[PDB]
Design a protein around this motif. Structure first.
Motif, PDB file in Angstrom:
ATOM      1  N   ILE A  76       6.713  -4.419  -7.129  1.00  0.00           N
ATOM      2  CA  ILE A  76       5.865  -3.493  -7.250  1.00  0.00           C
ATOM      3  C   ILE A  76       5.677  -3.023  -8.584  1.00  0.00           C
ATOM      4  CG2 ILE A  76       5.619  -2.694  -4.819  1.00  0.00           C
ATOM      5  CD1 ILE A  76       7.588  -0.389  -5.553  1.00  0.00           C
ATOM      6  N   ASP A  77       4.519  -2.183  -9.137  1.00  0.00           N
ATOM      7  CA  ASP A  77       4.267  -1.801 -10.382  1.00  0.00           C
ATOM      8  C   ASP A  77       4.772  -0.272 -10.488  1.00  0.00           C
ATOM      9  OD1 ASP A  77       2.884  -0.187  -8.684  1.00  0.00           O
ATOM     10  OD2 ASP A  77       0.924  -0.400 -10.085  1.00  0.00           O
ATOM     11  N   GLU A  78       6.168   0.169 -10.182  1.00  0.00           N
ATOM     12  CA  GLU A  78       6.857   1.113 -10.075  1.00  0.00           C
ATOM     13  C   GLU A  78       8.264   1.060 -10.171  1.00  0.00           C
ATOM     14  OE1 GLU A  78       3.017   3.338  -8.817  1.00  0.00           O
ATOM     15  OE2 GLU A  78       4.836   3.447 -10.206  1.00  0.00           O
ATOM     16  N   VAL A  79       9.042   2.196 -10.377  1.00  0.00           N
ATOM     17  CA  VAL A  79      10.422   1.969 -10.400  1.00  0.00           C
ATOM     18  C   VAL A  79      11.011   1.587  -9.057  1.00  0.00           C
ATOM     19  CG1 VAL A  79      12.673   3.262 -10.720  1.00  0.00           C
ATOM     20  CG2 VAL A  79      10.910   3.764 -12.279  1.00  0.00           C
ATOM     21  N   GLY A 130       0.856  -1.217   0.194  1.00  0.00           N
ATOM     22  CA  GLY A 130      -0.206  -0.027  -0.003  1.00  0.00           C
ATOM     23  C   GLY A 130       0.771   1.398  -0.135  1.00  0.00           C
ATOM     24  N   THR A 131       1.512   1.415  -1.177  1.00  0.00           N
ATOM     25  CA  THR A 131       2.555   2.591  -1.334  1.00  0.00           C
ATOM     26  C   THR A 131       1.641   4.021  -1.427  1.00  0.00           C
ATOM     27  OG1 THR A 131       2.812   2.426  -3.763  1.00  0.00           O
ATOM     28  CG2 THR A 131       4.433   1.075  -2.320  1.00  0.00           C
ATOM     29  N   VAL A 132       2.494   4.979  -1.121  1.00  0.00           N
ATOM     30  CA  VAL A 132       1.879   6.520  -1.700  1.00  0.00           C
ATOM     31  C   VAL A 132       1.797   6.526  -3.149  1.00  0.00           C
ATOM     32  CG1 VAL A 132       4.473   6.850  -2.374  1.00  0.00           C
ATOM     33  CG2 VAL A 132       2.633   8.820  -1.659  1.00  0.00           C
TER      34      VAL A 132
HETATM   35 MN   LIG Z   1       1.693   1.832  -7.399  1.00  0.00          MN
END
Ligand SMILES: [Mn+2]
Ligand SMILES: O=P(O)(O)OC[C@H]1O[C@H](OP(=O)(O)OP(=O)(O)O)[C@H](O)[C@@H]1O
Ligand SMILES: O=P(O)(O)OC[C@H]1O[C@H](OP(=O)(O)OP(=O)(O)O)[C@H](O)[C@@H]1O
Ligand SMILES: [Mn+2]
Ligand SMILES: [Mn+2]
Ligand SMILES: [Mn+2]
Lengths: 343, 341
Positions: free
Chosen positions: B219-222, B86-88
């Motif tokens: 995660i779906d981010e860098v 549950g990221t920013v």
């Molecule tokens: Mn994300």
């Protein structure tokens, strides 16, 4: 928990027996939303159902069933699925077997306009509304009873709509013969696919029969083959015995499937009765080879040929036995109309 | 093909053709299929394992039934979600930086803090009809396009999706189905396993440049802590790239600083980052922006992108202020800014 089970099934992880049993119970009880039931039933089929899952679902259905107790009864029943539209041979065979042993069959009316065991019995005059205590009485007096799933597996109504809307076959379609509500310890079990023999025999071995014989018959039916080879597994406390049998090992030539095909319940009834009158020998032979194996499962004969010979003596007394079964639980006047049409 | 033959096909593990998958998606999305049968089909697709052709057909189907506005020169930065962190709301934060130098067309649904949710806590009016949307992009170089308005046919499968409670094909198509048809795209994917699959799908979906990225730990981010695996997709083909967080000229970012428990908490962290009061959230935003900048050919490399993102982040609160004032309630933004200061 339905949600993790599904994730587990999606990942192609087999369920343990107790997992599977609880899953089946929640579903059958109508505690699981239709969307998730559909998901589970599809996931099970695409993964390929395992032994533990078959055993668990079987035990769940048995536990949720309304029961009577005739452990010494035999049942002869198949999974269905072949769809060749052949005569109701296990129903006819039950009548031969009832002369020498208690028989307890169960099931549902077929969809229109197919012919299930219930439907042929009804065409013959049998009353399928049989409460438990009456069932007990009927088996004592006449060595036969048919137990309608509507009354003895009443919770199955909770999965009916998903099953119907899905169209496809699911785990439930291979559990019928493993969920006899009379607790019949002797069983001839027909399976429509050769690939399911192994799964179901291994499952059966943990479902607590005295003897259960599983049969697959060419060209692809849940019965002893009238055209060629029968692939069978003999399951007992001793283990699982492989057996391959041809129709010629009964001492007869192959029966053409054309002769066994029926177009309604009445037509099935007429065919059966004509075989009992000695007026349809192809159907009589089909009935007799299937009875022969049932006799062997009961340990009444030492081999399948003797079973076949012994079935010949039983078929000659079967119309009279059918009359006593139907007179005790049904409308004899419907049997007499079928007999007139069979003569 | 009718539905019952399609399911048969999928249960037998036969891949659908692009046009078959597309016509199957349309029927599903139009509400023409019973929920039990939609459930079965989505589960069979996942059991079988969805193919490139299926991904492409389903995505094209959504694109077809979408309400469309024309902003291809826009960029989007958006992910598939999944992975359990549950990221920013980093891509939405990144969108605000990117809007300084390029039009941004964000899209999606409310989640407990998705992109729509953080925007609403900041005071943004997430329902923007097409005409004024193009207007607000012209004016402020940013717009959020709500799936409720722009993907209305998806309302026909919301129940099945939520009831199933598992990821399905629809959960990898979000960043492939922008209603504005942005030709530049940073696409987050939460698993290495779909990177190849989604990038090959994306290659057939007519982007000028789409960069797919998977970030460790999942995660779906860098990746804020380690390696990022990415695919750069264009008319030229699919290019493989491995990138550690150290390549941006920084050390690992403690993951706990990036985690959020409400939409307001995600909003406060973002605003704090713009004010220069949460340097770790700032760094997370900046590494993701750096990769966006690279997709737009704004920078020669990811170090350059990161450095320039720092210039952009210093203007982002004032940009956020002009965006929300043109479309939403600034008194909500100020309340957040007071919580942030
Ligand atoms: Mn994300
Ligand atoms: O389609 P379902 O309702 O699940 O039933 C499956 C099969 O089980 C019954 O056979 P059974 O062996 O009991 O009798 P039969 O061989 O006389 O038809 C039935 O008549 C179907 O063939
Ligand atoms: O669960 P769904 O509704 O299908 O959405 C999947 C993800 O897409 C959005 O991310 P986006 O990259 O747009 O914003 P973020 O990365 O800033 O949160 C969103 O907030 C979810 O993380
Ligand atoms: Mn049968
Ligand atoms: Mn049969
Ligand atoms: Mn994102």
């Amino acid at each position: 928990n339905i949600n993790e089970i599904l994730k587990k099934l999606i990942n192609k992880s087999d369920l343990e027996i107790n997992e599977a049993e609880e899953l089946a119970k929640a579903i059958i009880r109508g505690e699981v939303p239709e969307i998730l039931v559909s998901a589970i039933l599809v996931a099970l089929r695409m993964k390929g159902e395992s032994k533990n899952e078959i055993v668990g679902f079987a035990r769940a259905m048995r536990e949720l069933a309304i029961k009577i107790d005739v452990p010494n009864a035999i049942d002869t029943a198949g999974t269905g699925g072949g769809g060749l539209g052949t005569v109701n041979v296990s129903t006819a065979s039950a009548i031969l077997l009832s002369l020498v042993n208690p028989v307890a069959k169960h099931g549902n009316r077929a969809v229109s306009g197919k012919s299930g065991s219930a439907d042929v019995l009804e065409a013959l005059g049998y009353n399928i509304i049989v409460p438990p205590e009456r069932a007990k009485e009927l088996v004592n007096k006449t060595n036969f009873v048919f137990l309608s799933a509507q009354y003895y597996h009443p919770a199955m109504k909770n999965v009916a709509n998903v099953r119907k809307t899905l169209g496809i076959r699911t785990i439930f379609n291979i559990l019928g013969p493993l969920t006899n509500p009379a607790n019949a310890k002797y069983q001839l079990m027909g399976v429509f696919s050769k690939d399911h023999l192994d799964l179901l025999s291994k499952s059966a071995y943990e479902l607590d029969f005295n003897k259960i014989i599983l049969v697959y018959g060419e060209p692809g039916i849940d019965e002893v083959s009238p055209i060629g080879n029968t692939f069978m597994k003999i399951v007992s406390k001793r283990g699982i015995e492989e057996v391959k049998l041809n129709v010629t090992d009964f001492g007869i030539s192959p029966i053409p499937i054309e002769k066994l095909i029926v177009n309604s319940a009445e037509d099935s009834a007429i065919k059966i009765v004509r075989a009992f009158l000695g007026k349809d020998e192809h159907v009589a032979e089909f009935i007799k080879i299937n009875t022969a194996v049932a006799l062997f499962a009961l340990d009444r004969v030492g081999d399948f040929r003797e079973g076949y010979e012994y079935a010949d003596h039983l078929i000659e007394k079967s119309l009279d036995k059918l009359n006593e079964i139907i007179s005790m639980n049904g409308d004899v006047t419907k049997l007499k109309t079928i007999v007139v049409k069979s003569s």
